Symmetry: C11
Subunit: 138 residues, 11 copies
Amino acid sequence: CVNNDTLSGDVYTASEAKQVQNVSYGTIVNVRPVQIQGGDDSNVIGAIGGAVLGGFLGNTVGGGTGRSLATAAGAVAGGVAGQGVQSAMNKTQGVELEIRKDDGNTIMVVQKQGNTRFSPGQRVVLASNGSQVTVSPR
Amino acid sequence: CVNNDTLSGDVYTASEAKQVQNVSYGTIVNVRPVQIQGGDDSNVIGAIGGAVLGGFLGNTVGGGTGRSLATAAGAVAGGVAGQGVQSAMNKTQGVELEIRKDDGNTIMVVQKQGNTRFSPGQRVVLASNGSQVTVSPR
Amino acid sequence: CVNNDTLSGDVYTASEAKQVQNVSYGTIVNVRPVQIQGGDDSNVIGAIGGAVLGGFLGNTVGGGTGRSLATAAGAVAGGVAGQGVQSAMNKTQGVELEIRKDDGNTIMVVQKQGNTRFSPGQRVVLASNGSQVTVSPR
Amino acid sequence: CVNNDTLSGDVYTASEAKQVQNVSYGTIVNVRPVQIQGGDDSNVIGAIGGAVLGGFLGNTVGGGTGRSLATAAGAVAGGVAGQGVQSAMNKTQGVELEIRKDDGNTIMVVQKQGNTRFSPGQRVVLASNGSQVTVSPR
Amino acid sequence: CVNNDTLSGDVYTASEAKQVQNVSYGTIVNVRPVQIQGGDDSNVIGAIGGAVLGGFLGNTVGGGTGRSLATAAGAVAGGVAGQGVQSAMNKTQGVELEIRKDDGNTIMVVQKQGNTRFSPGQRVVLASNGSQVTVSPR
Amino acid sequence: CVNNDTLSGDVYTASEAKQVQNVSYGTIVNVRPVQIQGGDDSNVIGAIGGAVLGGFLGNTVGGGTGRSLATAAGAVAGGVAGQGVQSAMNKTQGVELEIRKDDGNTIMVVQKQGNTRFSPGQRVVLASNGSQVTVSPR
Amino acid sequence: CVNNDTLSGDVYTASEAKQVQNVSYGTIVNVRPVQIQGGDDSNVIGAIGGAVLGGFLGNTVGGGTGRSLATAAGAVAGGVAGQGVQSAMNKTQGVELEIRKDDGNTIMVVQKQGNTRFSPGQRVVLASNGSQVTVSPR
Amino acid sequence: CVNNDTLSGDVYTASEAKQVQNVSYGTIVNVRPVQIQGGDDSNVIGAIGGAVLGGFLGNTVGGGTGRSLATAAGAVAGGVAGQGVQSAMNKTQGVELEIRKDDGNTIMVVQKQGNTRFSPGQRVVLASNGSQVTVSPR
Amino acid sequence: CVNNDTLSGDVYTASEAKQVQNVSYGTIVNVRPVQIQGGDDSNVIGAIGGAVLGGFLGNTVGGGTGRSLATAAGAVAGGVAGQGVQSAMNKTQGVELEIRKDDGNTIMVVQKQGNTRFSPGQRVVLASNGSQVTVSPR
Amino acid sequence: CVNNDTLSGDVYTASEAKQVQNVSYGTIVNVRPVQIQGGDDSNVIGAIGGAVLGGFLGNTVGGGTGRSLATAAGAVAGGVAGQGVQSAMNKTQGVELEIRKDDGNTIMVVQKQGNTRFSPGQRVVLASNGSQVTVSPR
Amino acid sequence: CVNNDTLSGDVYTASEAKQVQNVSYGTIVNVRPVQIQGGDDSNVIGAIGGAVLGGFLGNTVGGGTGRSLATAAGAVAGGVAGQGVQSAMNKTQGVELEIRKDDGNTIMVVQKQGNTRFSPGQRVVLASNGSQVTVSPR
Ligand SMILES: CC/C=C/CCCCCCC[C@@H](O)CC(=O)N[C@H]1[C@@H](OP(=O)(O)O)O[C@H](CO[C@@H]2O[C@H](CO[C@]3(C(=O)O)C[C@@H](O)[C@@H](O)[C@@H]([C@H](O)CO)O3)[C@@H](OP(=O)(O)O)[C@H](OC(=O)C[C@@H](CCC/C=C/CCCCCC)OC(=O)CCCCCCCCCCCCC)[C@H]2NC(=O)C[C@@H](C/C=C/CCCCCCCC)OC(=O)CCCCCCCCCCC)[C@@H](O)[C@@H]1OC(=O)C[C@H](O)C/C=C/CCCCCCCC
Ligand SMILES: CC/C=C/CCCCCCC[C@@H](O)CC(=O)N[C@H]1[C@@H](OP(=O)(O)O)O[C@H](CO[C@@H]2O[C@H](CO[C@]3(C(=O)O)C[C@@H](O)[C@@H](O)[C@@H]([C@H](O)CO)O3)[C@@H](OP(=O)(O)O)[C@H](OC(=O)C[C@@H](CCC/C=C/CCCCCC)OC(=O)CCCCCCCCCCCCC)[C@H]2NC(=O)C[C@@H](C/C=C/CCCCCCCC)OC(=O)CCCCCCCCCCC)[C@@H](O)[C@@H]1OC(=O)C[C@H](O)C/C=C/CCCCCCCC
Ligand SMILES: CCCCCCCCCCCCCCCC(=O)OC[C@H](COP(=O)(O)O)OC(=O)CCCCCCCCCCCCCCC
Ligand SMILES: *C(=O)CCCCCCCCCCCCCCC
Ligand SMILES: *C(=O)CCCCCCCCCCCCCCC
Ligand SMILES: *C(=O)CCCCCCCCCCCCCCC
Ligand SMILES: *C(=O)CCCCCCCCCCCCCCC
Ligand SMILES: *C(=O)CCCCCCCCCCCCCCC
Ligand SMILES: *C(=O)CCCCCCCCCCCCCCC
Ligand SMILES: *C(=O)CCCCCCCCCCCCCCC
Ligand SMILES: *C(=O)CCCCCCCCCCCCCCC
Ligand SMILES: *C(=O)CCCCCCCCCCCCCCC
Ligand SMILES: *C(=O)CCCCCCCCCCCCCCC
Ligand SMILES: *C(=O)CCCCCCCCCCCCCCC
């Protein structure tokens, strides 16, 4: 598992506490919903778990030289299902926001859904660092 | 398997959440369909799976010194089929779009087919970063 | 465990004693509560502890070739719970402060809750270094 | 095997989707046919497969100390044939095109044969990147 | 253990003897007490000691296959307590001083409590190097 | 073996497909025939093959302590012949051409013999890259 | 042990013999006594010695499965005492001197106590190198 | 063995085919014969071959503890002869030529003897690259 | 042992023979005696010798499980004495000289005592290199 | 052995064939004879050969525990003689020449004796490269 | 052993043959005798030889557990003597020369004694390179 709950507007990772961050103001338009896929593309941990759990389910059939074939088939047929499952428990739902600043410049930012509802027409304050931004309501 | 579903216009990888992205506008012409081939060219994981599953199907014929020949032949004849199959499950279908911006400059971008249909003559908004672009309808 | 108690306004890590730090003054507005998530995202130590403690609970059922299946299942079903638990004991509660300096510039800083209560309207003194800040009351 | 089907004008590798590419126009003259040789020059995978399959065909003759000689001879006499065969299944047929752009500058590009026929006298559109080009008909 | 007694105003580490250090003068205001946490955040030595001492307390109960479960549980239940204890014996008490120099510039420095008492209103002499300072009374 | 058939004027390596190449014109004079020696100077693969095939031909004579001498002699007397043979199957025949460009500058290039005959007095077109050239007839 | 007797004003390390050193003059004020702590903070050699000497004192009590517990407890209870003792035999006594040069500039230097007594009001000669100084009486 | 036949005026190494080379003209004077010594100075492959072939010729004399002495002596007395012989089969015969160019500048180049005879007074054409030259007759 | 006899004015290390060195003249004042401590601070070779020689003196007392305790105690009680002795045989006696050059500049140099006596008031010649000096009498 | 016969005026190493070298003229004065010492200073190959050949000559005397002493003594007493002999077969005889060029500049070069005699008063031609020179008679 | 006979005025190392060296003239004054110490300061090869030869002289006394003590003592008591002897066979005798050039500049150089006698008042010629010099008589 990967704990991608540090991608909300209500939780800070501990490597950015006790630092300085700048402040700007803006306005909000055109929110639409979006899905977020964390983790890594080459799933390795799922493969090994699936492989062992599928292989040890193979010994219990047959006997002789027909048992080795069963365990060998079960190994790969569980290995692929491991990657099948390990990349469907790392999928959350978020929103995409288009904010227009008071400078006159427009940007958009994507952020995980929490327990506050964003609406078209509102005032937000941007807490920013070098290439990092958090958006919080009024 | 490789999870190339992060190449759509409705799914964001989690390493580009909580960042700033610029906004432009444009118009759409000349969409045509295209196929997309993910993964890597040197298939290694397919070779080993094919090899073991083909080798363990060789012991069950013959006996003596004619069993070793059977298992040795089965090993390679399954090894090549492993790469044959592992590079036909990583093939998806997408579209290629030619968008003309309001600057007066023309570009084209290629993107995976989803559940929205693009048509000739429409307004799109480009969300851009340094050498990254996502296209979404009006 | 990770000892993230060095993120308070009353405890200094020992690698920043006997050094020089600058002093500024400011005023405080708009405190709101926030949670803090320490540690690292890829939980490794939890996985091994969960795995061993789940595996050694598997031998005590069944016998023959039905014991191996039980221990193999218990191993992974404890492995995932290890990461489930090891990333819920590293979660503390803090505050977020917006301070306006006497220069005329505005910043905000996030800091762990202690035993002093911050209120809207107060005088604070910032002890600063290069990209490090501690806030302490009057 | 090497999957050199990403060298056509109808298939895009997945590492160049969702990017920006420029557009130019031109005219076509002097197409002639050409062969294309993929892969790598030092064939290693063919050698091992040929070696094992030739060696295990050696035990079945003779007995005593005249069996070792047979297996040793078969090993190398299959090893060289492995490289003989593994570099004749990576050979495709393509075309070479000489296109004159509307700038007044002339270039030529080589590309794999597909299912569309190029003729002398036609209009093509070049989709280009930094040192990458794809040619597609009108 | 970590010997953090070289963080006082009466003990010099031996890698800064026979060197040259500059001298300044100042005045002292606003001392307040503070705690100091040495060592390192990832406690490793505590984990192994706790693990072995907890594991060898497990064999003495039960017998058969119920002994392995006891030793496995004791191992982790002592492992976490090892880190619990090894990071509570590296905690000392010090003071924080705000000194105003004769230049007209203000700084503050934090230093371990010894056997001399600092008071508001006094003369101190700063012995300094590049980014190192020791404060000693008149 | 080394597959040096990518050194002709009718076969392109697959790492230079879908790229841009410049075009020039010229005239041809003074072709003379030449031999080409591929591969590498320190022959290693030939040594091991020769060594094993010569050594296993030594056991079949004599017995006692006079067999070890025979196998030891055969090993080296086959080892040197391995390098003798492995560097006589990598030798092809090509031509050397002196072409005078329309600029007024003269160069010469060497290229493997194919199935087209070059003659003194003819028109050729040079397809060029940075320090790469292919010559093809009119 | 660490031989920190090369930190006196009467002993030179052998890597700074046969070199050139500059000469200055000064005057001496305000000597006060100080302690010096050599060695390294992470004590490793003490831990192993304490561990072995404590462990081999554990076998001599009890018998059965109650001997293993005794040796395991003795190991750690001697391990910590090893670091307790190995960092109390590397502690010497020295002096701190404030010397005012004839330039008009003031410095202070710290140096191990020997067999000569420094007094307030005296003439000293500084033998100096790049960031190295030795002070010797008249 | 080392195949130093790529040092003639009639054989090209395959890493310099399909490249561009410049052309100059000159005249020839003062050819004299010279020997050429290829390979490497520290002969390693000869030592091992000589050592094994000399050692296995030692067992066939004597018996008891007088056999070990014989094999040990034979090992080194064959080892040195290995380097004696392996550096006398890498010695060829060539010529040294002094050519005066039409610029007015003089150079000389050394090249292996082939099947063409160079004479004093003749016209040669130099095919050159960066610090590489081949000389061929009219 | 360390052979620190190359620190005299009558012995040259062999890495500075056949080189060029400059010559200057001067005068000598204020010689005083000094001790020199060679070697390295972390004594390793003494520890192992002391450890083995102390450990093998432990077996000769007692028997049973009271022999292991004796050998374990002897090991460390000889280990520390090894470092005690190995750093008292690398201590020589030298002199420190203050020489005033004819330029008008003053320096001092430290050098091992030999068989010539230096006196206040004498002429010396300095043989110098880059940051190396030897002093020899008239 | 080291084959230092490539240091004559009649043998070229094969890494400097087919290159360009410049030509100068001069005159010869003051030849005197000199010895040349090749190889490397730390003789390793001689030590091992001497060691084995001396050790295997030790078993043939005595018996019991007096044989081990003999073999141990013979090992080192042959080891030193190995380096004694291996550095007396790499010693050749050469000449040193002082040549005055037609520029007006003087140099000298040292070169191995061959089969031509140099005399005072003669004309030589220098074939030169960057920091390489060969001298050959008229 | 180390062969430091390449530090004379009559023997050239073979890595500086066939190179160019400059020539100067001078005059000679004030030769005095000096000793030269080659090799390296940390003697390793002597330690092992002394250790083995001393250890194998220990078994021949006593029996039981009193033999181990004898061999252990002999090992170190021979080990130190190994370094005692291995650094007294690398000591030669040379001379130090002060030469005044015709420029008007003075230098001195140190060189091993040979079979020619240098006297006060003579003419020498310096053969020089970058930071290398050899001095030879008229
Ligand atoms: C707070 C919570 C605390 C937690 C833990 C604390 C509890 C501690 C209390 C300790 C008490 C315990 O000591 C008592 C005891 O065990 N006592 C036991 C002990 O006696 P003692 O007391 O020790 O003296 O031993 C006896 C011996 O048992 C048998 O011994 C034979 C050999 O023994 C012999 C011999 O011939 O050599 C003869 C004998 O006389 C003697 O001499 C021995 C001698 O010992 C030599 O060593 O040797 C074996 O044949 P073999 O070896 O030659 O092959 C045989 O297994 C055999 O031959 C082969 C077996 C194997 C087939 C079972 C697999 C099912 C597939 C499910 C996956 C689904 C896929 C999607 O085959 C069979 O058993 C045939 C069953 C056919 C029907 C199956 C239907 C199931 C599917 C339904 C699906 C429904 C869908 C809707 C074996 N059965 C056996 O050992 C037992 C076998 C019986 C199957 C019951 C079905 C349950 C399946 C439901 C699934 C759960 C939800 C997912 O059970 C097991 O192998 C363990 C099963 C684990 C499965 C986990 C699934 C993981 C998830 C999926 C992973 C992919 C047991 O009877 C005793 O009783 C019993 O054990 C009765 C017991 O009450 C039943 C077991 C319950 C455990 C289940 C929970 C596990 C969950 C996870 C754990 C972390
Ligand atoms: C040019 C120069 C050439 C150089 C070399 C060439 C010489 C070659 C000639 C060969 C002849 C030789 O083959 C003859 C022979 O050995 N012949 C011998 C041979 O017969 P074969 O001919 O082989 O057939 O074997 C016999 C067997 O001997 C005994 O055998 C017992 C077991 O044997 C049994 C059994 O019961 O199992 C029974 C038996 O019947 C038979 O069956 C065997 C069978 O073989 C099974 O294997 O088994 C052992 O008991 P165990 O095993 O169960 O434990 C016993 O040792 C035992 O039980 C245990 C012993 C051990 C205690 C001794 C340690 C002393 C501490 C000093 C350190 C100071 C610290 C600061 O305990 C005792 O011996 C009790 C002694 C109590 C009094 C000690 C006082 C000393 C202190 C004084 C301090 C004064 C201060 C002012 C053992 N003694 C023994 O094996 C002998 C034991 C006797 C002690 C004498 C005191 C000397 C100490 C002075 C110190 C010197 C200066 C520093 O001696 C030794 O262990 C070697 C001692 C080495 C000490 C070196 C010190 C190093 C420096 C300090 C290091 C930190 C010997 O008698 C024969 O005679 C003898 O051996 C008599 C002999 O003349 C005496 C030995 C002299 C050697 C000394 C020189 C070494 C210096 C360095 C060398 C490089
Ligand atoms: C941070 C979490 C770390 C988790 C690691 C714990 C591993 C637990 C292994 C259980 C071993 C059971 C063996 C079978 C039972 C038996 O009857 O075992 C019997 C045998 C000996 O008994 P006999 O005397 O009867 O032969 O072995 C033992 O008794 C071994 C002692 C068990 C305890 C060892 C301590 C744990 C390992 C060291 C800690 C390292 C931590 C590293 C953290 C990074
Ligand atoms: C974080 O998520 C860590 C990785 C989690 C791996 C989960 C593995 C589950 C594998 C299930 C396989 C079922 C096999 C069924 C028989 C073929
Ligand atoms: C992601 O896709 C991981 C790699 C998947 C590998 C799939 C391997 C399948 C191999 C089938 C081989 C069949 C052999 C039949 C007998 C020769
Ligand atoms: C700091 O916090 C160190 C890591 C702590 C790891 C804690 C591991 C607890 C695992 C509990 C698993 C329970 C399994 C129950 C049966 C499946
Ligand atoms: C992609 O193409 C992977 C490599 C394919 C290797 C194919 C190997 C075939 C070898 C056949 C050898 C036949 C030997 C017959 C007896 C000497
Ligand atoms: C410096 O402080 C070195 C590290 C010290 C480690 C101390 C380890 C103490 C562990 C105590 C564990 C008690 C376990 C009780 C049964 C679970
Ligand atoms: C590409 O060419 C791969 C290397 C090919 C090696 C061929 C080895 C042939 C060796 C023949 C040796 C014959 C020995 C006869 C008895 C001494
Ligand atoms: C230089 O000082 C080298 C390191 C010295 C280590 C000294 C170790 C002493 C350990 C004493 C432990 C006593 C244990 C008593 C029973 C628990
Ligand atoms: C290319 O040339 C590869 C190296 C060739 C090595 C040849 C080795 C020949 C050794 C002959 C030794 C004869 C020993 C006779 C008894 C002492
Ligand atoms: C150069 O000096 C090399 C290192 C020399 C090491 C000397 C070691 C001497 C150790 C003596 C120990 C006496 C132990 C007595 C019983 C405890
Ligand atoms: C090139 O020269 C390779 C190294 C040659 C090593 C020669 C070794 C000769 C050793 C002779 C030793 C004689 C020992 C006599 C008894 C002590
Ligand atoms: C070049 O000089 C190589 C190293 C030479 C090592 C010589 C070793 C001699 C050791 C003599 C030791 C005598 C021990 C006597 C009994 C203690």
